[model samples]
Each structure stands twice: as C-alpha cells, then as structure tokens.
Target: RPYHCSYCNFSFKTKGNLTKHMKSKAHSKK
Candidate 1:
C-alpha cells in the first residue's frame, strides 16, 4: 500500500517505509 505524510507530502510504498520516514530527523523537522 502507498502511504502519504500530511506534513511533508512525502509518499512511501509501505507502512513500514512510512514509519521509517516519519522517524527520520528530516521528517521530524517538517
């Protein structure tokens, strides 16, 4: 499934990848 982050408008192919992106400092700053 594809997951999109509302804050950064970034898309990920999986929930796991989305979670990983959310955990990133770059994402945190957004």
Candidate 2:
C-alpha cells in the first residue's frame, strides 16, 4: 500500500514513511 500527502505532495510505499512524514514539521504545519 501507498500513502500520500496532498499538502506536501509526498508519497510513501509503506506505513513507516507515512508515519515519519506526519512527524515532520511541514506535515504538522499543513
């Protein structure tokens, strides 16, 4: 499965990537 963030235009192939991204400042700010 893949997870994507519309605000940052970020894509991840695993839950870990998406989880890591959500922890990022950009993801939190958006």
Candidate 3:
C-alpha cells in the first residue's frame, strides 16, 4: 500500500499522480 489516495479513492499507484490529483484536481475544491 505504498500509494493510497483517500479523498477520492483514486488508487494512485504513482506518488506523482497523487500530487497531480491534489494540485490539479480532486479534493482541492475550495
């Protein structure tokens, strides 16, 4: 379980992908 995205349960296997999701998409909606 090296990479487990929680916000959307996207299952981002790559850490970079998780970061991208945070910075460019998902959960950061405010």
Candidate 4:
C-alpha cells in the first residue's frame, strides 16, 4: 500500500517511509 502527504502531495509505500520523507530536505522546503 501507499501513503500520501496532503501537505506536499508526496507519496510513499509505507507510513514509516512517509514519515522519513516528511523530514527530507525537499519536504521541509515545501
């Protein structure tokens, strides 16, 4: 399954991966 961040419209395969993506530089910049 995949999860998406409404804040940035980013998607990931898992919540854990999405959590990490939220902390990424690109996400932070948004």
> How many residue pairs clash in all the candidates, one count each?
0, 0, 0, 0
In candidate 2, stretches whose alpha carbon ends up further than 4 angstroms from where it belongs are none
lDDT by residue (1-30, candidate 2, tens digit) is 468875767788988888787876654663
Q: Candidate 4 deviates by what RMSD?
A: 3.3
Q: Per-candidate TM vs. native?
A: 0.53, 0.54, 0.47, 0.46
Predicted candidate 1, C-alpha RMSD: 2.8
lDDT of 4 at 10: 74
Instruction: Residues 1-30, candidate 4: write the lDDT tens digits.
Output: 468885767788888888787766654554
Name the better of 2 and 3 by lDDT: 2
Give the winner by lDDT.
Answer: 1
Give stretches of model 3 more than 4 Å off: none
Pairs that clash in candidate 1: none
lDDT (10s digit) by residue, model 3, range 1-30: 466665667767788877777767567564
Cα RMSD of all models vs. native, in order, equals 2.8, 2.3, 2.6, 3.3
Question: What is the per-residue lDDT of model 1 for residues 1-30, given as tens digits with 9 covering 90 to 100?
Answer: 469885877888888888887777654654
lDDT for 23 (candidate 2): 74
